[PDB]
Request: fold
Amino acid sequence: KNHPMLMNLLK
Amino acid sequence: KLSEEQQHIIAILLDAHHKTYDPTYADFRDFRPPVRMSPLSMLPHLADLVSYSIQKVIGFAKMIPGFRDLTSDDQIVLLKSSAIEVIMLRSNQSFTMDDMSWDCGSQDYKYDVTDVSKAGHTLELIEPLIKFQVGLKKLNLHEEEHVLLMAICIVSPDRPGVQDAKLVEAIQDRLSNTLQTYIRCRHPPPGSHQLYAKMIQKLADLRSLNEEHSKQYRSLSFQPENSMKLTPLVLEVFGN
Ligand SMILES: CCC[Si@](C)(c1ccc(OC[C@@H](O)CCC(=O)O)c(C)c1)c1ccc(OCC(O)(CC)CC)c(C)c1
Reply:
């Protein structure tokens, strides 16, 4: 449900 | 006809592709080794290849004009749904019709239909995927058209879970009109004949490929021994 790696690469 | 804003969009996207696609393929040395010598012997290497490519797709997407005006939720929805399709599009650069393979600079990193099958996939995916690679290669796209098509693919308003569909559509429309105008002004005939319609057909083809890849990925990743060989990024983006 959380996308922390994608969120992080998205800045 | 091609407005200065449209020329600016093209310039940004060409630069974004140059910053996120490395045609020397130097980083492939970092991936777990391909094994070819049945077990899924190519799964570790191809999981690392796919995971690396996802990172490059996110880096490209962040540079698309307007993408950063979307909410984080919508940026996430759009990358989760499009990454598989952008990987198929961008891999066309290394695909060669000489032997229908993806040639990334050396024999170790030259991939054929057998390598895809050794990551667990079947002809249900692989046959349409080769037909797509051949059809796209035959369009002989200008680099300008290739980067616009990748951007249009990412910014699609009909992806599942999109919240602000009207804003996604407004951003895509600016890219679509840039591409349509580029073809009419800069792509000489006969190569330009029905080119925009043929490029949009490739986006429909990608939806079909996405649906099949997702079905097989779900079956593969459901087996814990296979999921163990994936990467954390692949599990987050493609699903867990
Ligand atoms: C056999 C290869 C054929 Si593929 C089209 C490929 C070819 C060249 C590539 O890279 C070219 C260059 O583009 C890289 C440089 C850059 O992008 O910057 C890339 C990324 C992919 C392939 C294979 C396996 C697979 O999934 C397996 C899986 O479902 C197993 C569970 C998920 C792990 C996927 C999604 C796609």
Summary: Chain A touches chain B at residues 3-7, 9-11 (CB under 8 Å). The two ends of chain A are 18 Å apart (CA to CA). Chain A is about 55% helix and 0% strand.
